[PDB]
Assembly symmetry: D2
Homo-oligomer: 194 residues x 4
Amino acid sequence: KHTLPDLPFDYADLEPVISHEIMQLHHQKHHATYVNNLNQIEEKLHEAVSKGNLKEAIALQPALKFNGGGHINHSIFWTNLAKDGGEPSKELMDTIKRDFGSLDNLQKRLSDITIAVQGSGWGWLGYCKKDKILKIATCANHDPLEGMVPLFGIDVWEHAYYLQYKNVRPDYVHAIWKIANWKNISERFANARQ
Amino acid sequence: KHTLPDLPFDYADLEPVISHEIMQLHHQKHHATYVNNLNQIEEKLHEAVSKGNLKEAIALQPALKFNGGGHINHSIFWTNLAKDGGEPSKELMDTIKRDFGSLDNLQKRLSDITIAVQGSGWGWLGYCKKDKILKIATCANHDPLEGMVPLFGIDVWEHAYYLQYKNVRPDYVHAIWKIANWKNISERFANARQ
Amino acid sequence: KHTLPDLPFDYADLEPVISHEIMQLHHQKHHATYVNNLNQIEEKLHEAVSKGNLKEAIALQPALKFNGGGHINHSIFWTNLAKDGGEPSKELMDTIKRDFGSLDNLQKRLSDITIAVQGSGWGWLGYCKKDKILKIATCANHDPLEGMVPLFGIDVWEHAYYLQYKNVRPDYVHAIWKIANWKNISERFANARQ
Amino acid sequence: KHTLPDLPFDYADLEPVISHEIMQLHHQKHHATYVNNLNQIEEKLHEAVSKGNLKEAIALQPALKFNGGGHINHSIFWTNLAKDGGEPSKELMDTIKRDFGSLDNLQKRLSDITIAVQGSGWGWLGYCKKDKILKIATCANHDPLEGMVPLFGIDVWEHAYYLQYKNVRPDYVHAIWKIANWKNISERFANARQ
Ligand SMILES: [Mn+2]
Ligand SMILES: [Mn+2]
Ligand SMILES: [Mn+2]
Ligand SMILES: [Mn+2]
């Protein structure tokens, strides 16, 4: 069944950008809760789809999306962060330049749309295999990113930043680039491009 | 596996309120398509859930909701229509009077919200078990009627009326009350109160 | 133009249920921001609607809803909270009993749907003048409550509780009833019922 | 005040691809209704904004979006259709080849997503100024095409095809390319790149 993945670092290792208390709650309470609930829902969905209990299958969809999306998004998020993440691979940098002009333009554009999310959500850098281009997008709540492979996500649910940054979401979104795990992001890019 | 239910009457039995060409297309083409697509989508969902492919399972939700709702809604709709519908049961009529004042008030209010649907959708009379009251609502596309048991539905997708009524949706919505199957609606009401 | 209303109490007066820091940020940063942005948007919307700049009018809608809704909701919220709120009027209690059985059932049912909000949102007790009944509902983000008069709202955006309650939204939703301003809620009920 | 634009051709000029009865209803009934409703809704919105009645202004958003989008979309659609459409301009064809590989690939991809619309909506070819690329998208109902300038639209509301094509939407979507007004589409492209 689905399990809570261990973080690739210790709870305080992203300080001073994201605090120990945030990492601890975000992992041990929020992500844990999505996993526990997803397992209950997924079992129920398997039951209903097998038995052709259609009204119940349809009813279980929003909870599967929310908790499943929560599990997907946070699992990617933890791999996307590092105390010293390094720099983008030459192939990823070259592609960032091609599709956004520069890393600066990408960071600005993604930070801006992510900051602008109304309510809870996530910003994403992804790769679209069909049209062979990097794209940026936002998603409401825990809706998984669709139509492109995720590379780097920024959680802008208030629980992601509030204990440290309070209302100042922009400072958190700008600061998270300091701990972007470019090694991992580059690996995801390579994989999406095979 | 889901199957297309036979109509409880022949294709021309609802004339002049709904034409035989409409009933033929609506059942043999539209509903049949929802069933065929539903079966394929359920198969793909069962596979995704069995494999633990969470992103794939979530991605199938819109299609299951759309085709599953299509199957559910049209299945109900055929049972809700009759040339000889009869009258509400005393218990249903009494409840209509209690909750809407009169059958006249119910018909007007449900017709008005149904006529007002922007795009494709349905109008519903339903029964809420929790609060033991009749309610009316509309749903977009084939979205689920949430929190109430469906009693009587009015399809205002353009395919439900256009060949006969053209753009004049109101003439259709007002006329459908003439073929409401109150025997069926009363049975659904009795079941909902069990 | 729209202005930030003063709170009817001092920032620490709802302790220990809602902290001074939360009240201060919630009022001086979050609500202030909705007001400042609403004024900019409303001016732009007036411009576009007067000049028949239709694409721009449509584009400005989501920001008007979000900031306008923010202003509406928070203005009601501050009047809904008090250190000693009193008890519901006899007329409101009688109506709560009629429509929910008891205050306990109302509190449980409203707390449950409010707790269950996926992402950011609000829970509401309202009064529907058409069917002359109390109702409960939730709204996503800052979508104003529609179809009924608002009486009591519970903000479950994470900024409403996180500094104090962290992830434990249920404890905040249960505890807020301790500071429900029943004098104000009763007054809104009386007004909705004229 | 908004007005119903005359068609740039007579009602039967698009036969056998779109019937004269469809063109007549679509323009004289459907589009006319969007215009008439738009004018009324704009008036009510102007009044609400002038009065500072924020809840009322917000409540009018769905109707403005729906009728305003109806007016915008159909206005574009009439200019996008011609018996003698011609061929894309060299600059547009070159861009189609750059961004989709071929006109064949564009037509297939846009047709497929358009055919796949669940419920009422539209398919679009558009141009994104920011990234200087052509894109395709669908929109539900009359929702705005966001972030790109519309070039060519395909209405797949059932009223756009049902009298002629009945349930066979694909035959309509494949056939409409025969009457795409490439002169108009090329002009819109040139304007979008200014
Ligand atoms: Mn999170
Ligand atoms: Mn139908
Ligand atoms: Mn708030
Ligand atoms: Mn149309």
